[PDB]
Structure 1
Amino acid sequence: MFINRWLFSTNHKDIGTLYLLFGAWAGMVGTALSLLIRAELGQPGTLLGDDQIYNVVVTAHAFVMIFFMVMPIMIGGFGNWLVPLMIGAPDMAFPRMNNMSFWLLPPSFLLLLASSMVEAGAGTGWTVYPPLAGNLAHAGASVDLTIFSLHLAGVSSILGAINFITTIINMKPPAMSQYQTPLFVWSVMITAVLLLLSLPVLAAGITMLLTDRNLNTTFFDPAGGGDPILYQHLFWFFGHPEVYILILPGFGMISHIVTYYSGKKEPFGYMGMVWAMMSIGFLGFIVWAHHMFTVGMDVDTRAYFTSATMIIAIPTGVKVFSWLATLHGGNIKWSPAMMWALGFIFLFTVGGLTGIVLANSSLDIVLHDTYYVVAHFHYVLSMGAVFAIMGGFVHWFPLFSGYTLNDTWAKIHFAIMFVGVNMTFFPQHFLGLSGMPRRYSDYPDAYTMWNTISSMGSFISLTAVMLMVFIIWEAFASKREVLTVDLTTTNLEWLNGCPPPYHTFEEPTYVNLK
């Protein structure tokens, strides 16, 4: 019974719930790791020890938050939960395969946990670049385990990418065109395509790294005629699409949240919005090298990559401005989710603006490998991707559970986290302009002030993720059942009540062919 339901599932709703549960827990581990990082940097000196134990921590932080919290939650959680409901499908195209996608995750996570236990773990950076990641500077099972964890997580994500594209394309009502599906669905259909094309190149890269250190190959070893830079190309070819794969579903949720709380029927410029994500997804494939400005490449190619990278601002701009245009004549409701949506719009703008700066190779020479880049991506990840997750979570919680959250508490939670993340990452812009490198367990005396303030902010964030856990408990402890939902005419996900039954759309949906 429990087994059949929870271990042998073929239900998009239950698999989606299983994901959210996996993502939340992984989110705890990643938070703990981020605290050890700021604990180590909150006072001049060494708390843990050498850059090895420290960088092992920094590496797990990245893998956990990227592959085990953000991706599972947005794509597996909201993806599986909402997609079928938004297009009127009974389930997904491949219910069984969908389950394997999920179950591949816990093992993948185990391998990553195991890696930091055996030997001295993997202090290579999330980019696990060779020669440091090689069998000399990093002998032992650790890196190998890190590689296998990544293989599984990749197999999991492209299998799911296959499911979402097939479902989304093949399972909509016969009269509904693609230009009739909601932005969130478009958002995951496009993210699914990026995963399908980038993930395999990564697997090609790390498999080459695996043979280099166990089978005596020399793909990245100069001795045999290899090239450590070749790994950089392969990794980053996936590495960039990967960050868009991380923000796109967030773009979608934001479009849904802003529109709903503005009391609007639809988002402003729907086709412009579809065009924008498609452009973003595409340009995202031809700019990888901006991560290699100080590697010794030709000035000309270095010029190409700074330009190519900059044009991504245009489409992203039409999206920011569209969400604003959406708020326009709206009847605004200051709900928790709307608060998260507004924060995202601003904070993400700042963080992406800061990324345009780094787009310049000349300036990037002095900005690369410093805390400026740590600020850039935490703005777009800690107050971009994450803010979307929170807005979507508080907005759809009633649909998933049937129960409601205490809005006041939910608002308190935003206030605390908003202060925390800004205090944590704002100072870091300075540390980076002033020269503080990345991946250091200690720094020259001058960087003491900002690092201190920065670490204090991380403690406020800790407070907020603790409160959230409680906020979820209370919701489930009180049991206020949902009664009425607004704007369902334009929001299908809610039409079957909270929570929708195990089997929805048993009998299709009627859509006329005008």
Structure 2
Amino acid sequence: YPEKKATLYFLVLGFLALIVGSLFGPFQALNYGNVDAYPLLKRLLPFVQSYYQGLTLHGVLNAIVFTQLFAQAIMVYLPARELNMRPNMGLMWLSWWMAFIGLVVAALPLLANEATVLWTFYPPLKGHWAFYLGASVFVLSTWVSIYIVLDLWRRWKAANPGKVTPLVTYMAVVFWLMWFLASLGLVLEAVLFLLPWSFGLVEGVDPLVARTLFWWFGHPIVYFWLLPAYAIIYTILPKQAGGKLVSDPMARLAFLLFLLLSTPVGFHHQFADPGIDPTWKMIHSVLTLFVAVPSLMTAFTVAASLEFAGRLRGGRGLFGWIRALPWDNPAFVAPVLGLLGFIPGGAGGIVNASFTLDYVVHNTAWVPGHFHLQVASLVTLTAMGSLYWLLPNLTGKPISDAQRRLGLAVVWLWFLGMMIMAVGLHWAGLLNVPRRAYIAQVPDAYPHAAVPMVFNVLAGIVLLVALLLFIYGLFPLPFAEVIDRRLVLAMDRIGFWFAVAAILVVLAYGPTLVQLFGHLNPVPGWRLW
């Protein structure tokens, strides 16, 4: 199996990216604890010129690079293994190399303080062409994954007319199709503006158009992060817990719904933008509340599976099933722990989405509090835990009891530290503390924040230990069994649902983008770092 080697390469590069980005984590957390440790960081890593270059690296490496690499590993290999078929190897290595080349190329300007824009890179803040070109080639790698998976699907569908798509593959097909749609937003932003602008071709870019296109791509990216964790949670975790998936139909419906609802929702990042018609912001508001539905459904489907495992293993009572679960298996613990923090995380989400309620929290410490529960915790934790089944399956190499225990330690410390940090930022944001801000540098600005600040420091240390330990550590697939055919058949009419998904985007962005393209106002770029 050459697909294992390709997959391992994707995972390894993703974890390197995780460690490097995460290095800035502790320092940032202390910063939100009003403690300034950047002199110490600058001594260690002398190329770092500022908190903000640090913030760029953190965000790009952790939230773009690791998460993407993790998706391309999981959401190619897993379907390939379900089908028992080979991926096109030439393409698979092509994908890897684009990822790897685009990464190197963006890394240059990034390391050289030439692109300190954040992971969002909002014009007129003007970065080095190599950042945009490198980031572009980075993301486009996925277009190759999309193809590969569609290829596998079709080849199997040929061998097997009149059979429903198997589950994992179904998941990945709706996932990758969803991503093709979402990705266009960025492709459009890079090609029509970012690249031309950064190479010196046009003299300005219109900030409102760039944000609109950005956020077409910017929301479904988070679902693109989550869904790989989900696939595992649904089709692997249940075996890990000693149970079984409780509904294959319900899982398909979850995923189907993400395909329909992941992209047409972007204005929920733009409730505070001028020049978007408020009626549109309401529309995207409802559509966003809609997109919470598949998660609400996932909360139930999954809990039911865990309870089921718990009763099988002989836990009785209302809480008995909980203590019967295998709390000794890090591959089970990590995703469940992340599920728990996903409760208040999604709660914050539903808050952010409600149009006016976003004015309370927009651009405060609240947002980072919300999303560290989402991606930094549930996704990352799920990734960390797969190591304990995914490595052996890929490498031949077995996990010792020692390595097992050190894994339990890391996941717990990472979870707890994340939960503590989430209390700090949510609370700090309720007190009006801004996000993306070297606040420790204005020590007397936010005195009312003294308490949540203690949480932030604590978390920095807890998360530093966990990172340190994770580093020190880093140096058949357990697919679960399942416990209404017609619904299943409806959900298998993929081109149809794909079509619908596309219409929903045209409908949600068309009127506003046409309006904006008719009235462009490009403005000169700036480097204020």
- Alpha-carbon distance in 2 for matches of 1:195, 1:87: 22
Q: Verify the 8 A CA contact 2:423 2:452 in the aligned structure 1.
A: no
TM superposition score normalised by structure 1: 0.81
1:64-89 per-residue CA deviation (whole Å, 9 max, x = no partner) reads: 1122211112x232334433221111
1:341-386 per-residue CA deviation (whole Å, 9 max, x = no partner) reads: 2212221222112100011121111211111111111110111111
Q: Which residue of 1 aligns with 2:254?
A: 276
Q: Verify the 8 A CA contact 1:52 1:123 in the aligned structure 2.
A: no
Match of 2:273 among 285, 295, 298: 295
Query: Are 2:285 and 1:285 aligned?
Result: no
Q: Which residue of 1 aligns with 2:222?
A: 243
Task: Note the 1:342-491 alignment, pairs <5 A.
Answer: 342-402=336-396, 403-406=398-401, 407-442=404-439, 443=442, 444-446=445-447, 447-473=449-475, 490=481
The structural deviation recorded for 1:45 is: 6.0
The structural deviation recorded for 1:180 is: 5.2
- Alpha-carbon distance in 2 for matches of 1:410, 1:215: 49
- Alpha-carbon distance in 2 for matches of 1:427, 1:41: 8
- Alpha-carbon distance in 1 for matches of 2:131, 2:450: 33
Q: Verify the 8 A CA contact 2:26 2:461 in the aligned structure 1.
A: yes
Q: Verify the 8 A CA contact 1:104 1:153 in the aligned structure 2.
A: yes
Q: Which residue of 2 aligns with 1:154?
A: 139
Match of 1:164 among 124, 130, 149: 149
Match of 2:25 among 14, 26, 34: 34
> CA, structure 1 residues 67+299, in 2 after alignment: closer, same or farther (shift >3 Å)?
closer
Which sections of structure 2, spanning at least 5 residues, go unmatched? 43-47, 314-324, 483-529
Q: Which moved more, 1:38-47 or 1:380-389?
A: 38-47
Q: Verify the 8 A CA contact 2:2 2:89 in the aligned structure 1.
A: yes
Q: Verify the 8 A CA contact 1:237 1:285 in the aligned structure 2.
A: yes
- Alpha-carbon distance in 1 for matches of 2:6, 2:332: 27
- Alpha-carbon distance in 2 for matches of 1:308, 1:32: 36
The structural deviation recorded for 1:116 is: 2.6
* 3-state SS of 2:123 partner: coil
The structural deviation recorded for 1:467 is: 2.1
Q: Which residue of 1 aligns with 2:318?
A: none
Which sections of structure 1, spanning at least 5 residues, go unmatched? 1-9, 134-141, 221-226, 474-484, 492-514
Q: Which moved more, 1:31-40 or 1:359-368?
A: 31-40
> CA, structure 1 residues 177+378, in 2 after alignment: closer, same or farther (shift >3 Å)?
farther
Q: Which residue of 2 aligns with 1:198?
A: 182
> CA, structure 1 residues 318+41, in 2 after alignment: closer, same or farther (shift >3 Å)?
closer
> CA, structure 1 residues 438+174, in 2 after alignment: closer, same or farther (shift >3 Å)?
same
Query: Are 2:297 and 1:333 aligned?
Result: no
The structural deviation recorded for 1:306 is: 1.3
Q: Verify the 8 A CA contact 1:59 1:123 in the aligned structure 2.
A: yes
> CA, structure 1 residues 172+397, in 2 after alignment: closer, same or farther (shift >3 Å)?
farther
1:414-443 per-residue CA deviation (whole Å, 9 max, x = no partner) reads: 222222111222210011111011111115
The structural deviation recorded for 1:488 is: 7.5
- Alpha-carbon distance in 2 for matches of 1:216, 1:349: 47
**Alignment size in residue pairs:** 450
Q: Which residue of 2 aligns with 1:82?
A: 78
- Alpha-carbon distance in 1 for matches of 2:153, 2:306: 28
Amino acid at match of 1:236: W
Q: Which residue of 1 aligns with 2:5?
A: 14
* 3-state SS of 2:50 partner: helix
- Alpha-carbon distance in 2 for matches of 1:152, 1:173: 32
List structure 1 segments (4+ residues) > 6 angstroms apart after TM superposition: 485-489
> CA, structure 1 residues 131+105, in 2 after alignment: closer, same or farther (shift >3 Å)?
same
Q: Verify the 8 A CA contact 1:87 1:173 in the aligned structure 2.
A: no
* 3-state SS of 1:171 partner: helix
Amino acid at match of 2:269: H
The structural deviation recorded for 1:177 is: 6.6
RMSD of Structure 2 on Structure 1 (CA): 2.6
Match of 2:234 among 248, 255, 277: 255
The structural deviation recorded for 1:44 is: 5.2
Amino acid at match of 2:11: L
Q: Which residue of 1 aligns with 2:299?
A: 320
- Alpha-carbon distance in 1 for matches of 2:3, 2:94: 12
Amino acid at match of 1:144: W
Amino acid at match of 2:399: T
> CA, structure 1 residues 177+68, in 2 after alignment: closer, same or farther (shift >3 Å)?
farther
* 3-state SS of 2:384 partner: helix
Q: Verify the 8 A CA contact 2:33 2:453 in the aligned structure 1.
A: yes
TM superposition score normalised by structure 2: 0.79
1:279-317 per-residue CA deviation (whole Å, 9 max, x = no partner) reads: 122211110011000112322222112111111122221
1:213-255 per-residue CA deviation (whole Å, 9 max, x = no partner) reads: 44443663xxxxxx31011111110111111111001111111
- Alpha-carbon distance in 1 for matches of 2:92, 2:480: 30
- Alpha-carbon distance in 2 for matches of 1:389, 1:294: 34
1:239-280 per-residue CA deviation (whole Å, 9 max, x = no partner) reads: 11111111001111111333103433x411211110111112
Q: Which residue of 2 aligns with 1:482?
A: none
Q: Which moved more, 1:343-352 or 1:207-216?
A: 207-216
* Aligned residues with identical type, % of pairs: 20
- Alpha-carbon distance in 2 for matches of 1:36, 1:353: 27
- Alpha-carbon distance in 1 for matches of 2:211, 2:299: 32
Q: Which residue of 2 aligns with 1:3?
A: none
- Alpha-carbon distance in 2 for matches of 1:219, 1:169: 44
The structural deviation recorded for 1:199 is: 1.9
The structural deviation recorded for 1:41 is: 3.9
* 3-state SS of 2:125 partner: coil
> CA, structure 1 residues 206+353, in 2 after alignment: closer, same or farther (shift >3 Å)?
same
The structural deviation recorded for 1:16 is: 0.6
- Alpha-carbon distance in 2 for matches of 1:488, 1:236: 35
Match of 1:62 among 48, 59, 64: 59
Q: Verify the 8 A CA contact 2:418 2:459 in the aligned structure 1.
A: yes
- Alpha-carbon distance in 2 for matches of 1:376, 1:176: 44
- Alpha-carbon distance in 2 for matches of 1:44, 1:413: 24
Q: Which residue of 1 aligns with 2:110?
A: 116
